[PDB]
Amino acid sequence: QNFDYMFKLLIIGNSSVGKTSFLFRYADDSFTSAGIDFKVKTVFKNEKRIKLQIWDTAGQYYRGAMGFILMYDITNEESFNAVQDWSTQIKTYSWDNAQVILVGNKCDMEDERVISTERGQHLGEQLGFEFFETSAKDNINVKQTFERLVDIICDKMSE
């Protein structure tokens, strides 16, 4: 209730890549196969209490963002080819303090994977964004994405 810091976080990427599910898995530790612009979660980093305002309005503005989660779907090449456009919109129309994690979502759908782990890692290195493969569905690397984002926002905040 009594936080030291508040970070504005945006989830961006093409529609159907799992932006909304990623948010719902992190904030309500839920996912379902079956109105909300943002959700709030408070996290503990070192002794600090950090309020996260996590926005999910990409599929419907950037200047204030501490942090971006740039999502593509590993089962959809179009979502991954689009990452460059998304990255361009970030580095242009954002606070030059903003951190970014590249996220290949739905790593649970191994049979329909069209994007390799290493293509993802390689695009990460090209764009200068750390990278995680995730599943909102199986709860894989959702926690680690947000906490890594908080950590690097803190590092930059300290500089």
Ligand X SMILES: Nc1nc2c(ncn2[C@@H]2O[C@H](COP(=O)(O)OP(=O)(O)O)[C@@H](O)[C@H]2O)c(=O)[nH]1
Please give the annotated binding residues for GTP, written as ranges: 15, 18-21, 32-33, 59, 105-106, 108, 136-137
Q: Nearest residue to ligand X, using CB?
A: 18
Q: Tell me if 139 contacts Mg ion by CB under 5 A.
A: no
**Least distance in angstroms from the C-beta of 23 to Mg ion:** 8
Q: Nearest residue to Mg ion, using CB?
A: 20
Q: Which residues contact 66 (CB under 8 A, 6 or more apart)?
A: 7, 8, 9, 95, 97, 98, 99, 153
**Least distance in angstroms from the C-beta of 20 to ligand X:** 3
Both tokens of residue 17? Answer: 């890549």
Closest to Mg ion by CB, 20 or 53: 20
**Of residues 20, 53, 89, 139, which one binds Mg ion by CB under 5 A?**
20
Work out whether strand 38-45 and strand 48-55 pair parallel, antiparallel, or are unpaired.
antiparallel
Contacts with ligand X, 117-146, as mask; x by CB under 6 A: ------------------xxx---------
Q: Among 58, 17, 20, 53, which residue's Cα sits nearest to residue 38?
A: 53
92 φ/ψ angles, rounded to the nearest 5 degrees? -80, -75
Residue 152 contact partner, candidates ligand X, Mg ion, none, CB within 5 to 8 A by sort of partner: none
Q: Which residues contact 32 (CB under 8 A, 6 or more apart)?
A: none
Give Rg (Cα) of the chain.
15
Site residues, ligand X (CB under 6 A): 15-21, 33, 59, 105-106, 108-109, 135-137
